[PDB]
Amino acid sequence: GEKVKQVLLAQAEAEKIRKIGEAEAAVIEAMGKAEAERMKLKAEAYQKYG
Amino acid sequence: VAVQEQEIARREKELEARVRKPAEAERYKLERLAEAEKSQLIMQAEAEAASVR
């Protein structure tokens, strides 16, 4: 009763870390692509400054 | 002596009902209650993950 309980809840902790890790990776990736568009557009505009 | 030769057969039944049966009932309770705690935490994990993404 102690063993099966501890094992089942340890799997829940591991499932949480994995799910949160994947969600975070998707956000970091998307945010990088958006930030790169700022850098590119800012550069393509600044390059024309008199 | 004959009286205590029957006290053996007595404790062998009393201990089954007092000691063994409830410990066995506790094991089944712990196991099916653990599945529920796990089920709630995996569903909550998925909710927190979706809310972050």
Side-chain angles (χ1 to χ4, degrees), chain A residues 1 3 5-12 14 16-17 20-37 39-50, chain B residues 1-9 12-17 19-26 28-31 33-36 38-47 49-52:
Chain A
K3 184 165 193 291
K5 193 276 295 186
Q6 287 180 358
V7 169
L8 287 167
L9 276 295
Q11 292 164 3
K16 181 181 293 284
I17 292 161
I20 292 295
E22 181 178 11
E24 271 273 28
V27 173
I28 293 297
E29 180 201 332
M31 200 63 63
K33 295 170 186 176
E35 284 173 356
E37 189 58 4
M39 297 173 178
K40 188 203 77 192
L41 290 170
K42 284 289 301 298
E44 286 164 351
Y46 272 145
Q47 173 263 1
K48 303 163 186 163
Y49 271 39
Chain B
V1 166
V3 171
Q4 270 154 16
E5 280 194 338
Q6 302 292 344
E7 291 301 352
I8 290 169
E12 283 168 355
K13 287 172 190 60
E14 180 192 25
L15 294 169
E16 174 55 23
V19 178
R20 285 179 172 147
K21 283 288 179 176
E24 152 49 25
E26 189 66 15
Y28 175 96
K29 184 218 297 171
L30 281 167
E31 193 168 34
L33 181 148
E35 285 176 339
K38 173 176 176 181
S39 178
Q40 179 174 11
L41 290 169
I42 183 58
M43 288 180 67
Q44 185 203 66
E46 181 68 0
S51 81
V52 168

